[PDB]
């Protein structure tokens, strides 16, 4: 699995994110999943999953997304599936 497998790898990474996200809000023992989702949100400048949209508020309730609502630039954050796509492609 390498370069010519871009679409596959991204698909897996997104799935990985989903799993972490699901674990991060469902349980309170899952601290590694919380750390993983926080790191994805901070590194990729995203927040939430495009497939698990119903979880978004829970994600915010758990303080997993690092930006508040004072700055308008941070109100409209893209979900991490878009940011994963942008990462594995050259552009945005």
């Amino acid at each position: 699995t390498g370069f010519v497998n871009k679409d596959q790898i991204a698909k897996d990474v997104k799935q990985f994110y989903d799993q972490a996200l699901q674990q991060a809000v469902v349980d309170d023992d899952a601290n590694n999943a919380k750390a993983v989702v926080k790191t994805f949100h901070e590194t990729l400048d995203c927040c939430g999953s495009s497939t698990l949209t119903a979880l978004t508020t829970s994600v915010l309730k758990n303080n997993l997304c690092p930006s508040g609502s004072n700055i308008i630039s941070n109100l409209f954050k893209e979900d991490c599936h878009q940011k994963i796509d942008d990462l594995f492609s050259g552009s945005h």
Partner: antibody, heavy 119, light 113 residues
Framework: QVQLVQSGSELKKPGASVKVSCKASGYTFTDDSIHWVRQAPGQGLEWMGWINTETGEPTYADDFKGRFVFSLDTSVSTAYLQISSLKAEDTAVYYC????????????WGQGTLVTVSS | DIVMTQSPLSLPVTPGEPASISCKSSQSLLHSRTRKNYLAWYLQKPGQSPQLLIYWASTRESGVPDRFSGSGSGTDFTLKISRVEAEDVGVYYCKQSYNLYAFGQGTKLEIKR
């Protein structure tokens, strides 16, 4: 648990001022902005504007630009709504709400403060 | 700015029957980058502050019963209740947050007898 607790009912005469408080708890108060919504008795909700809880800069809605002042005190995690030169039409319930990002909605509200202006 | 309009402004429903509330905005609420429709549905019950029911047009908030559902995109949106129950009476507002914030007139859901 997140809570926005506002001050009690106010009874003023036409021409005076009034200061309503909105104390936040359960989250970092300076992360999210605080918005104000007016509701006249028997009328709908109207967004009045918001205040940046980190810098203190207010932003007023067009219909509420003038006699309304959004102030702040982060030491006690409290937003304030001030109305000067009160008139009869200012009698209403004033809510504060916490804006959540990403979803851009008002999940957490205050119980509202009734302000009654009558000579 | 952006103007919100709700129909109908007064909705009496027989308990157990479905209900539908339409919401139309002057401009599109779809964000080109996030692909989200920044429209929400709040319910204000008698003597209470508004509570959030639906966000992003169709995502149900945690805890809201499944009989509440949102749909639509761009400028046309709808809030549906599969089975209207007694505890649902109150004023339903739609609110846009794409550019600033604006509430609809509100739909007072009452009981039909």
């Amino acid at each position: 648990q997140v809570q926005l607790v506002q001050s009690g009912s106010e009874l003023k005469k036409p021409g005076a001022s009034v200061k309503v408080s909105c104390k936040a708890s359960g989250y970092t108060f300076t992360d999210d902005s605080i918005h104000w919504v007016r509701q006249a008795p028997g009328q709908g909700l109207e967004w009045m504007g918001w205040i940046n809880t980190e810098t203190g800069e207010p932003t007023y809605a067009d219909d509420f630009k003038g006699r309304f002042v959004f102030s702040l005190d982060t030491s006690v995690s409290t937003a304030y709504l001030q109305i000067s030169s009160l008139k009869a039409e200012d009698t209403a319930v004033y809510y504060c709400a916490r804006l959540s990002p990403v979803v851009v909605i008002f999940i957490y509200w205050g119980q509202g403060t009734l302000v009654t202006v009558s000579s | 700015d952006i103007v919100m309009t709700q129909s109908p402004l007064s909705l009496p429903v027989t308990p157990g029957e479905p209900a539908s509330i339409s919401c139309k905005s002057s401009q599109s609420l779809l964000h080109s980058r996030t692909r989200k429709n920044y429209l929400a549905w709040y319910l204000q019950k008698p003597g209470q502050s508004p509570q959030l029911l639906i966000y992003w047009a169709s995502t149900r908030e945690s805890g809201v019963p499944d009989r509440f559902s949102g749909s639509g995109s761009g400028t046309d949106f709808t809030l549906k209740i599969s089975r209207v129950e007694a505890e649902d009476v109150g004023v339903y507002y739609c609110k846009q947050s794409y550019n600033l914030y604006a509430f609809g007139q509100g739909t007072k859901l009452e009981i039909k007898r």
